[PDB]
């Protein structure tokens, strides 16, 4: 299917957007975000509507849609 675009909001209000498929395991987004922030992936927690995003969660499982927001907090 089509890519959807998700907005990842950092603790400093910065944003990095990601295009993912509905079947993409979100570990791939977590790893890329952590790489671009220059921090270990295990130092961060990623939330969708306040709930923790697991490595093997997909946008389909979480009910995500185009332009949904993920927030990043310190673990």
């Amino acid at each position: 299917g089509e890519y959807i675009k998700l907005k990842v909001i950092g603790q400093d209000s910065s944003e990095i957007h990601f295009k993912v498929k509905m079947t993409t395991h979100l570990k791939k987004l977590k790893e890329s975000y952590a790489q671009r922030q220059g921090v270990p992936m295990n130092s961060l927690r990623f939330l969708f509507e306040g709930q923790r995003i697991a490595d093997n969660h997909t946008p389909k499982e979480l009910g995500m849609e185009e332009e949904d927001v993920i927030e990043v907090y310190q673990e």
Binding site: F18, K19, K21
Partner: peptide, 15 residues
């Protein structure tokens, strides 16, 4: 900041 959008995407082996 500028907009940032990231796209998340053996027989040749010799080692």
């Amino acid at each position: 900041a500028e907009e940032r959008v990231v796209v998340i995407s053996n027989s040749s082996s010799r080692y």
